Design a protein around this ligand. Structure first.
Ligand SMILES: Nc1ncnc2c1ncn2[C@@H]1O[C@H](COP(=O)(O)OP(=O)(O)O)[C@@H](O)[C@H]1O
Ligand SMILES: Nc1ncnc2c1ncn2[C@@H]1O[C@H](COP(=O)(O)OP(=O)(O)O)[C@@H](O)[C@H]1O
Ligand SMILES: Nc1ncnc2c1ncn2[C@@H]1O[C@H](COP(=O)(O)OP(=O)(O)O)[C@@H](O)[C@H]1O
Ligand SMILES: [Mg+2]
Ligand SMILES: [Mg+2]
Ligand SMILES: [Mg+2]
Lengths: 536, 518, 44, 518, 43
């Protein structure tokens, strides 16, 4: 030191440095703490977890993306696993709990190789080559279901729906949830069975009632009620009609005023009396343009003054006030209407058409909500969920949201696999077979990747109270005797380890990302040597 | 290696499963003594302003008392939903959902049962409990006489758990007629509740009309006969027109006096159009100034100011009229009719009483009490009774109460437990023993036996008599059809469904993570 | 196959045994560098 | 009004109780995992000195862990009393006494039974349980062959829970021969236990003769053939003259030189009286000065010094001689003989070994282990095994163990429970289910389903076969006579009596007054 | 006797005792103000 303070970087004593074997041991144990948390919630026998927010709100979910999102951490290695499950939920939306277990399994097998003197890059080079050998092997085993007609294509959507609905709370209703999740895509989809638009399906939760009241409603569900509720709640169309002629207006009902700040100077009583007549002439003109167009229900973004409450009541025109701008886009899609900027552009061709407009009483008081139904197949499907608890209404949203993420992935052509641990076992023996042919220094790299794939089937046996040794040995001996890859772990214990008889189906695009996200993330973690963490 | 930050509490082990079950025990034991007509009220100590609140309802008790345990917040949320949906049974849901965790705690500890197995056991057990109530439901809506009588027996059961159990016989007709006035309307915001301090508790009455706390402005007479009531929502005081960009450019103040005089001419011309209706009474929800009020003196028209918008909808349904603005067209506008309008006084504050109104779709309830705590309790006691009777007009199915409905469901649960076999038989039979606690606590609050008295009710149903029930007055088994103890079918399904779903919540939590408070 | 037999309770001893092995292997790593003729002395 | 003072914690009624029940649950769960041969050891870390202890004994765990709960100390004291009177079964007493409160917790709650009424239920249940356990006992010691074989079966059962369970097959003979050599006298002061590092647990061998760690004199040889052993109570040291209380008055130093020489001749004449016995070996209780040590070399006498108070009686009984004080009369205090006095070395500390003595009334046990944590448990493992085998000499009544004894006692409880009218019959049946909790935990710690094993064992005994029991190796029902599981009647009687009385104390507490700590 | 219900809770009757003592203490303060011989109270 020579007697003078030696400071290279500001906040010297605040920041710490980790290097050597101690830096690698801290990174592996950081993933083991996250893995053992996620391994308990993996599989249909898993368990949820309570998430306490700093504001007092609680969240109960088993989803690895939601648990880690609200989780407050310290070590940066555990924070990298947070965005790992976030990467899985944002794109594919399925298998968020599997990418955390598989990534930590790669790190657990890598720690044993580091202690043997293997360079970390040589470990990462072996996982990259072994990842492409597992994907290419499973790609040859799967078959294309696109040859079936639309009648059988709906069955495959019901198969993968019931699988994603498991492992989560309120899993007893999955039979009806699987039916409602597929019908949303049947109504909203392209004629070529490709590139379906997910944004056309909205998730609207409601707190009350019971879960058995959840049903599909095609239309718009708004939180605003009819203005001046002297009008009937349920609106009915005319005897003969083309429709209800729903009107959408982004302009409030007011006398015309300049957008710029203006000054209207009245220099005489005669000029003031003309403003009185000019005032009432506009409210009479605005209500006549709607009646001449045949419209019935008028939707306003900014609302309107109390003057038009009785005016629209005389003509029997329902009206709503203070509708959000985002909801106006949702309204024009369901009724296939066009937003009318002003009364001068109002025409009968821009009016929307829906089957019925009505409101429900829901509970005792609560609030008044408007419901729109469609008379035929449309481009708008709104999910309606009820529950006796605020936590049930919340989790059921993302429970069906992840279920819709599985169905939209099946819209992509010629990608299907069977779940239940049958995919990881098939890809595990293919990597271990190449290790004997290659040998060399990378022979131990394929072994670590093969032992990591078997952790997912062994984790399924832990939550089901089984023997991971006896279950894994049966799956490996079955793939060697016969080429059928459909044998997997059964956590429901209905027998018939064949996945074909149990109908369990998973998207291949979801399972392919699990290997890519786990292998490519461990490649960056193993390269970390000096760890500089500043004090908070 | 600790991945979590500082001051982060988490239990990954037995301490978590212990804190989750015990956390619901303190919540269940708090509302346990409030179940039944013999239950006792609870006292709430406010942390600010020193405002005491005494309520028998479990929804207010759980929401007012701060609870940091997530296992407790689950039982608080299901009570708020039960209050907002059906309007009654918030305590029964909390107690029943807590007893499901009591029977599930001994299966995991002693019987070593898998948590999901207990959850899957309640799935097949709740299916038989809901189907047992369907066959026991009777629809009396085919006769208006039998349906109106059932509305009285339902009100006697709800008002029995509150402080009104003594006078509930007199208040059963007041709550029954108030629902008949709605003519099937489930909206409770149309009925006004005016709480008056002092007098006997049995002096509460229900007038036919609309009782308004507001009074006539200055010179309007108190009592008048054959008065047409009109309601106007908008403006009619110092009208600002509409746009805010209007100004008066004045060369000399001689012209300025004519511009302000024109504003009074606009007020006089608008009131002159009101006199064309031939009404003796005018009502504005917006407050009325002195200048427009004096114009009603020469016209003999009454004036009322500062009416709340939620009272306007209540007032419009009593008079059967129509809210009228833009008075230029008299034809399309409708007015309300009233036989007589008199200004009375209840206590220190004079009130405006209506009588002989055409439409009965809304009314006003007046209550009397010795203390404000009894007034706040009398309003909440009727709010729970009027909510069940409002939903009864929609769904007319009814199920007998008094411990009968809980024991009938347990009869079908024990039958399905034999065919399931496995280890779920302990979980299915645990759901039946959890249904025993609801009639058992009824006898505990009355000082009765929790074993022999319950066994008499259980052995009577298995002999082929489904009408047997528990009588807390005589402490024996009595018939529920004769005593008139019955509740709505929607209330029976809501308690079973909410408790079964809430029990599946905490049983799925192995780990509890607590972030640092903010 | 599931839901039957028994379910494991009080899983903390499973973590206690892991915490004891990890802490014991961390001590064995510092002494490991002193093994064999190529080992180094440890100054305390 | 607060009469007690500041910082005085007091609980009353339902607050006072349930503090004792949670206390027994928290204490009972600590030793619950230590019950049975498959139980897990608990590590205790002290808050100071950084001292750790691995022990499977329920008594030593409760003494080290600080407990401020007044009801927790109730279960700690009964674990000490069970350890004082017997030394084994301290874990079963803490568990059984806790299960009595767990069953009584639901009796006051679900069935609403007065606490004193439950006490009357245990009095009639424990009276019938001790009668059924006494009749199931088998007489012993009538045959010397069956008496020795029964002691081997007892050592295998006690050591089954200890870490010695792997090597207990060879240790059954180690602990058995130590009791037979006592010749009916029951004391553990005559049994020495020496800890040695290195080797394996099964390397522990039985000591023929008596082995005690000492050192020979500087000039004295190690091996003497047919040496005579004597123990002296008096120590060779400067005695002043006789009565103390004196000092020498020296007028001239001419007599001072012969004065110090006179003190040298006093101890020289004392050794001359010792040499009249013809002994080759001498043992003193305290340190010997170098001056008298040189007199033993010319006479060929071994010297042993710094003998502990316990080592005086252990050595005197093996040799057969008695402690000599005055040495005056040679005829009295006839001395024994030892064949081989040659010293051996175990580890880095040499141990003096004796062989071929007259009496085996005292014993020495050599133990070898890898760490002191094992040696600390190895001493306490044999201390609990030698205690029961020593009490079996005076008490010959023995019963079958392996969960069978608890089930046989519960059979007579359910028989007399049907003839007991009133609400106290429920407390009698609760005592029978509490006896079934001990064999239930035996299956839980072994990884086997408890519901299947207990149900098959419970129904098998009601059929008339009392020899059925639990087999944890095969996970099925097996005979206890074939497996060789035998426990003393004094052991099982002390468990039922101590647990039934401990639960009676905590049920009598309606208030707890905690004074301000010092 | 032994068949009676213990009710497990002596707290409800003890809470009412604490409520009556504090309620009577307030009514006893204005007791001296009753009647023509009553005394004024300055607050
Ligand atoms: N009913 C079932 N039968 C067999 N396997 C299942 C079932 N449900 C889920 N799995 C398996 O469990 C794994 C995890 O599924 P889950 O936890 O429900 O959602 P995620 O895949 O998002 O973690 C999947 O890979 C799937 O193969
Ligand atoms: N006279 C009576 N005899 C027997 N049982 C009664 C009588 N009156 C009310 N009950 C029972 O007492 C219960 C009161 O429950 P309550 O405290 O209202 O629950 P919650 O507060 O959840 O609505 C009812 O379920 C009813 O069956
Ligand atoms: N080999 C065995 N097979 C079956 N049961 C056993 C065996 N050894 C001990 N037990 C049971 O374990 C219980 C506890 O024994 P022990 O360890 O001597 O008492 P504690 O556990 O109280 O110290 C006894 O009641 C006995 O029935
Ligand atoms: Mg999923
Ligand atoms: Mg009620
Ligand atoms: Mg023992």
């Amino acid at each position: 030191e020579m007697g003078r303070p030696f400071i290279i970087v500001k906040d010297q004593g605040n920041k710490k440095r980790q290097h050597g074997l101690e830096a690698k041991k801290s990174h592996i144990l950081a993933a083991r703490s996250v893995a053992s948390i996620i391994k308990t919630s993996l599989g249909p026998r898993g368990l949820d977890k309570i998430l306490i927010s700093p504001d007092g709100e609680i969240t109960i979910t088993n989803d690895g993306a939601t648990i880690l999102s609200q989780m407050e951490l310290d070590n940066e290695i555990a924070k990298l696993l947070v965005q790992l499950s976030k990467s899985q939920d944002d794109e594919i939306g399925d298998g968020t709990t599997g990418v955390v277990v598989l990534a930590s399994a790669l790190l657990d097998q890598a720690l044993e190789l580091i202690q043997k003197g293997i360079h970390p890059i040589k470990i990462a080079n072996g996982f990259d080559e072994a990842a492409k050998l597992a994907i290419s092997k499973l790609e040859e085993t799967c078959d294309d279901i696109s040859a079936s007609n639309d009648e059988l294509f709906r069955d495959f959507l019901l198969r993968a729906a019931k699988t994603s609905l498991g492992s989560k709370i309120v899993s007893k209703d999955h039979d009806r949830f699987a039916e409602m999740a597929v019908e949303a895509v049947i109504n909203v989809m392209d004629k070529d069975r490709k590139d379906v638009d997910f944004d056309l399906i909205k998730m609207q939760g409601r707190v009350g009632g019971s879960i058995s009241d959840s049903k599909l409603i095609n239309g718009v569900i708004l939180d605003k009620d009819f203005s001046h509720p002297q009008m009937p709640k349920c609106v009915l169309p005319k005897e003969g009609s083309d429709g209800v002629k729903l009107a959408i207006l982004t302009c409030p009902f007011e006398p015309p005023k300049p957008k710029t700040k203006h000054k209207l100077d009245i220099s005489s009583v005669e000029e003031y009396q003309k403003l009185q007549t000019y005032e009432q002439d506009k409210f009479k003109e605005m209500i006549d343009d709607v009646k001449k167009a045949g419209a019935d229900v008028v939707i306003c973004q900014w609302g309107f003054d109390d003057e038009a409450n009785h005016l629209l009541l005389q003509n029997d025109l329902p009206a709503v006030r203070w509708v959000g701008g985002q909801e106006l886009e949702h309204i024009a899609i369901s009724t296939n209407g066009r937003i009318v900027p002003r009364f001068q552009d109002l025409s009968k061709d821009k009016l929307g058409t829906c089957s019925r407009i009505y409101e429900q009483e829901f509970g005792t008081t609560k609030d008044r909500m408007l419901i729109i139904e469609q008379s035929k197949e449309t481009k708008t499907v709104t999910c309606f969920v009820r529950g006796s608890n605020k936590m049930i209404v919340d989790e059921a949203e993302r429970a069906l949201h992840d279920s819709l993420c599985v169905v939209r992935n099946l819209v992509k052509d010629s990608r299907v696999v069977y779940g239940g641990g049958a995919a990881e076992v098939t890809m595990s023996l293919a990597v271990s077979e190449e290790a004997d042919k290659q040998r060399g220094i990378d022979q131990y790299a394929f072994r670590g990747f093969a032992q990591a794939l078997d952790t997912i089937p062994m984790t399924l046996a832990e939550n089901s109270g089984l023997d991971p040794i006896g279950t894994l040995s049966t799956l490996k001996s079955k793939q060697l005797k016969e080429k059928i890859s459909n044998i997997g772990v059964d956590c429901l214990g209905y027998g018939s380890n064949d996945m074909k008889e149990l109908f369990v189906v998973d998207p291949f695009i979801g399972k392919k990302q699990q290997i890519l996200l786990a292998t490519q993330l461990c490649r960056m973690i193993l390269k970390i040597d000096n760890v500089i963490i500043s004090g908070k | 290696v600790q991945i979590f930050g500082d001051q982060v509490t988490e239990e990954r082990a037995e301490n978590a499963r212990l804190s989750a079950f015990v956390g619901a025990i303190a919540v269940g034991d708090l509302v346990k003594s409030t179940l039944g007509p013999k239950g006792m009220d609870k006292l709430l100590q406010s942390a600010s302003s020193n405002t005491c609140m005494v309520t028998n309802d479990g929804a207010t008790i759980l929401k007012s008392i701060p609870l940091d345990n997530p296992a407790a917040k689950v039982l608080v949320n299901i009570s708020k939903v039960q209050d907002d949906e059906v309007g009654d049974g918030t305590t029964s849901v909390t107690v029943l959902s807590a007893e499901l965790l009591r029977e599930a705690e001994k299966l995991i500890d002693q019987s070593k049962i898998h948590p999901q197995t207990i959850i899957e056991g309640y799935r097949l057990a709740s299916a038989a409990a809901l189907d047992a109530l369907t066959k026991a439901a009777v629809d009396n809506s085919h006769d208006k006489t039998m349906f109106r009588e059932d509305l009285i027996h339902i009100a006697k059961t709800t008002l029995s758990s509150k402080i009104l159990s003594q006078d509930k016989d007199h208040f059963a007709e007041l709550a029954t007629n108030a629902i008949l006035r709605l003519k099937g309307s489930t909206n409770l915001e149309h009925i006004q509740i005016i709480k008056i301090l002092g007098g006997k508790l049995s002096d509460s009455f229900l007038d036919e009309g609309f009782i308004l706390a507001k009074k006539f402005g200055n010179n309007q007479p108190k009592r008048i006969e054959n008065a047409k009531i009109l309601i106007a929502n908008t403006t009619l005081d110092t009208d600002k027109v509409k746009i805010f960009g209007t100004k008066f450019k004045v060369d000399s103040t001689a012209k300025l006096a004519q511009l302000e005089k024109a504003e009074r001419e606009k007020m006089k011309n608008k009131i002159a159009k009101i006199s064309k209706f031939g009404i003796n009474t005018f009502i504005n929800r917006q407050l009325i100034y002195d200048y427009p009020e004096q114009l009603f003196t020469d016209l003999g028209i009454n004036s009322i100011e500062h009416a709340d918008f939620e009272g306007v909808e209540r007032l419009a349904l009593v008079t059967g009229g129509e809210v009228v603005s833009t008075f230029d067209e008299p034809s399309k506008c409708k007015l309300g009719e009233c036989d007589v309008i008199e200004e009375i006084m209840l206590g220190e504050q004079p009130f405006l009483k209506f009588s002989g109104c055409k439409a009965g779709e809304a009314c006003t309830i007046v209550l009397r009490g010795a203390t404000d705590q009894t007034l706040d309790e009398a309003e909440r006691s009727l709010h729970d009774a009027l909510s069940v009777l409002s939903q009864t007009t929609k769904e007319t199915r009814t199920v007998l109460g008094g411990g009968c409905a809980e024991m009938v469901m347990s009869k079908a649960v024990d039958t399905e437990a034999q065919n399931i076999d496995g280890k779920k038989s302990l979980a299915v039979e645990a759901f039946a023993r959890a249904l025993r606690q609801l009639p058992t606590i009824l006898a505990d609050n009355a000082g009765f036996d929790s074993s022999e008295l319950v066994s008499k009710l259980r052995s009577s149903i298995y002999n082929g008599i489904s009408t047997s029930g528990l009588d807390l007055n005589n402490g024996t088994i009595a018939d529920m059809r004769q005593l008139g103890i019955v509740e709505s079918y929607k209330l029976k399904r809501a308690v079973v469904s909410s408790a079964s779903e809430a029990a599946e919540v905490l049983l799925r939590v192995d780990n509890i993570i607590r972030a640092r408070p903010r | 196959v599931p839901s039957n037999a028994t379910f494991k309770n009080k899983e903390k001893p499973q973590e206690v045994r892991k915490a004891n092995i990890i802490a014991a292997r961390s001590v064995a790593d510092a002494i490991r560098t002193s093994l064999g003729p190529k080992g180094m002395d440890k100054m305390i």
